[PDB]
Amino acid sequence: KHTELRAAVLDALEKHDTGATFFDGRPAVFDEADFPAVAVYLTGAEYTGEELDSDTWQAELHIEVFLPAQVPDSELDAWMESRIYPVMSDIPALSDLITSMVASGYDYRRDDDAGLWSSADLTYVITYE
């Protein structure tokens, strides 16, 4: 498994997140965004993802924060930056590979059950360039 990533991200999660509700991966339940929760998912489990025994760290860190529909964009956005950035920066591997974590696209979603709720999908690709 690519579980080395899981360990790194979980450690950072433990140290820097709000600590409200965490998901190892996005659950197969009804829209999470009914309640405030955060899930962290890194690429390599969806597919074989080619297991790497390499010294270099590369992964997509896809972090999803789920918040009530009554939560405005600025608050969702704030939640994302204020927690997620200190979390990712806390990952030692990111410090090893790159000077600072390089941004990738932000997408706003809600797409499991009905989707009228609020979730913020932030994607970070590491070793992107």
Coordinates of N, CA and C in Angstrom, one line a residue:
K1 N 0.9 -1.2 0.0 CA 0.0 0.0 0.0 C 0.9 1.2 0.0
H2 N 0.3 2.3 -0.4 CA 1.0 3.6 -0.2 C 0.6 4.1 1.1
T3 N 1.1 3.6 2.2 CA 0.6 3.9 3.5 C 1.5 4.9 4.2
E4 N 2.7 5.1 3.6 CA 3.7 5.9 4.1 C 3.1 7.3 4.1
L5 N 2.4 7.7 3.1 CA 1.7 8.9 2.9 C 0.7 9.1 4.0
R6 N 0.0 8.1 4.3 CA -1.1 8.1 5.3 C -0.5 8.5 6.6
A7 N 0.6 8.0 6.9 CA 1.2 8.2 8.2 C 1.7 9.7 8.3
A8 N 2.2 10.2 7.3 CA 2.7 11.6 7.3 C 1.6 12.6 7.4
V9 N 0.6 12.4 6.5 CA -0.6 13.3 6.5 C -1.4 13.2 7.8
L10 N -1.5 12.0 8.4 CA -2.3 11.8 9.6 C -1.5 12.5 10.8
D11 N -0.2 12.4 10.8 CA 0.6 13.0 11.8 C 0.4 14.5 11.8
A12 N 0.4 15.1 10.6 CA 0.2 16.5 10.4 C -1.2 16.9 10.8
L13 N -2.1 16.1 10.5 CA -3.6 16.2 10.8 C -3.8 16.3 12.3
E14 N -3.1 15.4 13.0 CA -3.2 15.3 14.4 C -2.7 16.5 15.1
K15 N -1.6 17.0 14.6 CA -0.9 18.2 15.1 C -1.6 19.5 14.8
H16 N -2.0 19.7 13.6 CA -2.5 21.0 13.1 C -4.0 21.2 12.9
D17 N -4.8 20.1 12.8 CA -6.2 20.4 12.5 C -7.0 20.7 13.7
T18 N -8.2 21.4 13.5 CA -9.2 21.7 14.4 C -9.6 20.5 15.3
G19 N -9.7 19.3 14.7 CA -9.9 18.1 15.4 C -11.4 17.9 15.6
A20 N -12.2 18.4 14.7 CA -13.7 18.2 14.9 C -14.1 16.8 14.5
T21 N -13.9 16.4 13.3 CA -14.3 15.1 12.8 C -13.3 14.8 11.6
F22 N -12.7 13.7 11.6 CA -11.8 13.3 10.5 C -12.2 12.1 9.8
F23 N -12.0 12.1 8.5 CA -12.2 10.9 7.7 C -11.0 10.5 7.0
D24 N -10.6 9.2 7.1 CA -9.5 8.6 6.4 C -9.6 8.7 4.9
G25 N -10.8 8.6 4.5 CA -11.1 8.9 3.1 C -12.5 9.3 3.1
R26 N -13.0 9.9 2.1 CA -14.4 10.4 2.0 C -15.4 9.2 2.2
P27 N -16.2 9.2 3.2 CA -17.2 8.1 3.5 C -18.3 7.9 2.5
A28 N -18.8 6.7 2.5 CA -19.9 6.2 1.7 C -21.2 6.4 2.3
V29 N -21.3 7.5 3.1 CA -22.5 7.8 3.8 C -23.2 9.0 3.1
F30 N -24.2 9.6 3.7 CA -25.0 10.7 3.1 C -24.1 11.9 3.3
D31 N -24.5 13.0 2.6 CA -23.6 14.2 2.5 C -23.1 14.6 3.9
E32 N -21.8 14.6 4.0 CA -21.0 14.8 5.2 C -21.2 16.2 5.7
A33 N -21.5 17.1 4.7 CA -21.6 18.5 4.9 C -22.8 18.9 5.7
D34 N -23.7 18.0 6.1 CA -24.8 18.2 7.0 C -24.1 18.7 8.4
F35 N -23.0 18.1 8.6 CA -22.2 18.3 9.8 C -20.8 18.8 9.5
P36 N -20.1 19.6 10.3 CA -18.8 20.0 10.1 C -17.8 18.9 10.2
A37 N -17.1 18.6 9.2 CA -16.1 17.5 9.2 C -15.0 17.8 8.1
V38 N -13.9 17.1 8.3 CA -12.8 17.2 7.4 C -12.3 15.8 7.0
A39 N -11.9 15.6 5.8 CA -11.4 14.3 5.4 C -10.1 14.6 4.6
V40 N -9.2 13.7 4.7 CA -7.9 13.9 3.9 C -7.7 12.7 3.1
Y41 N -7.4 12.9 1.8 CA -7.1 11.8 1.0 C -6.0 12.1 0.0
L42 N -5.1 11.2 -0.1 CA -3.9 11.3 -0.9 C -4.0 10.3 -2.0
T43 N -3.6 10.6 -3.2 CA -3.7 9.7 -4.3 C -2.7 8.5 -4.2
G44 N -3.2 7.4 -4.8 CA -2.5 6.2 -4.8 C -3.2 5.0 -4.4
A45 N -4.5 5.2 -3.9 CA -5.3 4.1 -3.4 C -6.4 3.8 -4.4
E46 N -6.8 4.9 -5.2 CA -7.9 4.8 -6.2 C -7.5 3.7 -7.3
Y47 N -6.3 3.7 -7.6 CA -5.7 2.9 -8.6 C -4.6 2.2 -8.0
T48 N -3.8 1.4 -8.8 CA -2.6 0.8 -8.2 C -1.7 1.9 -7.7
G49 N -1.6 3.0 -8.5 CA -0.9 4.2 -8.1 C 0.6 4.1 -8.1
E50 N 1.0 2.9 -8.6 CA 2.4 2.5 -8.7 C 3.2 2.7 -7.4
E51 N 3.3 1.7 -6.6 CA 4.0 1.8 -5.3 C 5.5 2.2 -5.5
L52 N 5.8 3.2 -4.8 CA 7.2 3.7 -5.0 C 7.9 3.6 -3.7
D53 N 9.1 3.1 -3.8 CA 10.0 2.9 -2.7 C 11.0 4.0 -2.7
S54 N 10.8 5.0 -3.5 CA 11.6 6.1 -3.8 C 11.8 7.0 -2.6
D55 N 12.9 7.7 -2.7 CA 13.3 8.8 -1.7 C 12.4 10.0 -1.8
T56 N 11.9 10.2 -3.0 CA 11.1 11.4 -3.3 C 9.7 11.2 -3.0
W57 N 9.1 12.2 -2.5 CA 7.7 12.3 -2.2 C 6.9 13.0 -3.3
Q58 N 5.9 12.3 -3.8 CA 5.1 12.9 -4.7 C 3.7 12.4 -4.5
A59 N 2.7 13.2 -4.4 CA 1.3 12.8 -4.2 C 0.5 14.0 -4.4
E60 N -0.8 13.7 -4.6 CA -1.8 14.7 -4.6 C -2.4 14.6 -3.3
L61 N -2.4 15.7 -2.6 CA -3.1 15.8 -1.3 C -4.4 16.5 -1.6
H62 N -5.4 15.7 -1.5 CA -6.7 16.2 -1.7 C -7.4 16.3 -0.4
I63 N -7.7 17.4 0.0 CA -8.3 17.6 1.2 C -9.7 18.2 1.1
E64 N -10.7 17.6 1.7 CA -12.1 17.9 1.6 C -12.6 18.4 2.9
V65 N -13.2 19.5 3.0 CA -13.8 20.0 4.2 C -15.3 20.2 4.0
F66 N -16.0 19.6 4.9 CA -17.5 19.6 4.7 C -18.1 20.5 5.7
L67 N -18.9 21.4 5.3 CA -19.5 22.4 6.1 C -21.0 22.6 5.8
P68 N -21.8 23.0 6.7 CA -23.3 23.2 6.5 C -23.5 24.2 5.4
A69 N -24.6 24.0 4.6 CA -25.1 24.8 3.5 C -25.3 26.3 4.0
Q70 N -25.5 26.5 5.2 CA -25.6 27.9 5.8 C -24.2 28.5 6.0
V71 N -23.2 27.9 5.6 CA -21.8 28.4 5.7 C -21.4 29.2 4.4
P72 N -21.2 30.5 4.5 CA -20.8 31.3 3.4 C -19.4 31.0 2.8
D73 N -19.1 31.3 1.6 CA -17.9 31.0 0.9 C -16.6 31.5 1.7
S74 N -16.7 32.7 2.3 CA -15.5 33.2 2.9 C -15.2 32.3 4.1
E75 N -16.2 31.9 4.9 CA -15.9 31.0 6.0 C -15.3 29.7 5.6
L76 N -15.9 29.1 4.5 CA -15.4 27.8 4.0 C -13.9 28.0 3.6
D77 N -13.7 29.1 2.9 CA -12.4 29.4 2.4 C -11.4 29.6 3.5
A78 N -11.8 30.3 4.6 CA -11.0 30.6 5.7 C -10.6 29.4 6.5
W79 N -11.6 28.5 6.6 CA -11.4 27.2 7.3 C -10.3 26.4 6.6
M80 N -10.4 26.4 5.2 CA -9.5 25.7 4.4 C -8.1 26.2 4.5
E81 N -7.9 27.5 4.5 CA -6.6 28.0 4.5 C -5.9 28.0 5.9
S82 N -6.7 28.4 6.9 CA -6.2 28.5 8.3 C -5.8 27.1 8.8
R83 N -6.6 26.1 8.5 CA -6.2 24.8 9.0 C -5.3 24.0 8.1
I84 N -5.7 23.9 6.8 CA -5.1 23.0 5.9 C -3.6 23.4 5.5
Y85 N -3.4 24.7 5.4 CA -2.0 25.1 5.2 C -1.0 24.8 6.3
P86 N -1.2 25.2 7.5 CA -0.4 24.7 8.6 C -0.3 23.2 8.7
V87 N -1.4 22.5 8.3 CA -1.3 21.0 8.3 C -0.3 20.5 7.3
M88 N -0.5 20.9 6.0 CA 0.4 20.4 5.0 C 1.8 20.8 5.2
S89 N 2.1 22.0 5.7 CA 3.4 22.5 5.9 C 4.1 21.7 7.1
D90 N 3.3 21.2 7.9 CA 3.7 20.4 9.1 C 4.3 19.0 8.6
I91 N 3.9 18.6 7.4 CA 4.4 17.3 6.9 C 5.9 17.5 6.5
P92 N 6.7 16.7 7.3 CA 8.2 16.8 7.1 C 8.6 16.6 5.7
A93 N 7.9 15.7 5.0 CA 8.3 15.3 3.7 C 8.2 16.5 2.7
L94 N 7.1 17.3 2.9 CA 7.0 18.5 2.1 C 8.1 19.4 2.3
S95 N 8.6 19.5 3.5 CA 9.8 20.4 3.8 C 11.0 19.8 3.1
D96 N 11.1 18.5 3.0 CA 12.3 17.8 2.4 C 12.3 18.1 0.9
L97 N 11.2 17.9 0.3 CA 11.1 18.1 -1.2 C 11.0 19.5 -1.6
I98 N 10.2 20.3 -1.1 CA 10.0 21.6 -1.6 C 10.1 22.7 -0.6
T99 N 10.5 23.9 -1.0 CA 10.6 25.1 -0.1 C 9.3 25.4 0.5
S100 N 8.2 25.4 -0.2 CA 6.9 25.7 0.2 C 6.0 24.8 -0.6
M101 N 4.9 24.4 0.0 CA 3.9 23.7 -0.8 C 3.3 24.5 -1.9
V102 N 3.3 23.9 -3.1 CA 2.9 24.6 -4.3 C 1.4 24.4 -4.6
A103 N 0.7 25.4 -4.8 CA -0.8 25.4 -5.0 C -1.2 24.8 -6.3
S104 N -2.4 24.2 -6.2 CA -3.0 23.6 -7.2 C -4.5 24.0 -7.1
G105 N -5.4 23.6 -7.9 CA -6.7 24.1 -8.0 C -7.6 23.9 -6.8
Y106 N -8.5 24.8 -6.6 CA -9.6 24.7 -5.6 C -10.9 24.4 -6.3
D107 N -11.7 23.5 -5.8 CA -13.0 23.2 -6.4 C -14.0 23.1 -5.3
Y108 N -15.2 23.6 -5.5 CA -16.2 23.5 -4.5 C -17.2 22.5 -4.9
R109 N -17.4 21.5 -4.0 CA -18.2 20.4 -4.4 C -19.1 20.0 -3.2
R110 N -20.1 19.3 -3.6 CA -20.9 18.5 -2.7 C -21.5 17.5 -3.7
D111 N -21.1 16.2 -3.6 CA -21.6 15.4 -4.7 C -21.9 13.9 -4.3
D112 N -22.1 13.6 -3.1 CA -22.5 12.2 -2.8 C -24.0 12.0 -2.8
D113 N -24.8 12.7 -2.0 CA -26.2 12.4 -1.8 C -27.0 13.3 -2.6
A114 N -27.2 14.5 -2.1 CA -28.0 15.5 -2.9 C -27.1 16.6 -3.4
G115 N -26.2 17.0 -2.5 CA -25.1 17.9 -2.9 C -25.5 19.4 -2.6
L116 N -26.6 19.7 -2.0 CA -27.0 21.1 -1.7 C -26.2 21.7 -0.5
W117 N -25.3 21.0 0.0 CA -24.5 21.3 1.2 C -23.2 22.0 0.7
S118 N -22.3 22.2 1.6 CA -21.1 22.9 1.2 C -19.8 22.0 1.5
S119 N -19.0 21.8 0.5 CA -17.7 21.2 0.7 C -16.7 21.8 -0.1
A120 N -15.5 21.9 0.4 CA -14.4 22.5 -0.3 C -13.4 21.5 -0.6
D121 N -13.1 21.3 -1.9 CA -12.1 20.4 -2.3 C -10.8 21.2 -2.7
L122 N -9.8 21.0 -2.0 CA -8.6 21.6 -2.3 C -7.6 20.5 -2.8
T123 N -7.0 20.7 -3.9 CA -6.1 19.8 -4.4 C -4.7 20.4 -4.4
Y124 N -3.7 19.6 -3.9 CA -2.3 20.0 -3.9 C -1.5 18.9 -4.6
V125 N -0.7 19.3 -5.6 CA 0.1 18.3 -6.2 C 1.5 18.6 -5.8
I126 N 2.2 17.6 -5.3 CA 3.5 17.8 -4.8 C 4.5 17.3 -5.8
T127 N 5.6 18.0 -6.0 CA 6.6 17.6 -7.0 C 6.0 17.8 -8.4
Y128 N 5.0 18.7 -8.5 CA 4.3 19.1 -9.7 C 5.3 19.7 -10.7
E129 N 6.2 20.5 -10.1 CA 7.3 21.1 -10.8 C 8.4 21.3 -9.9

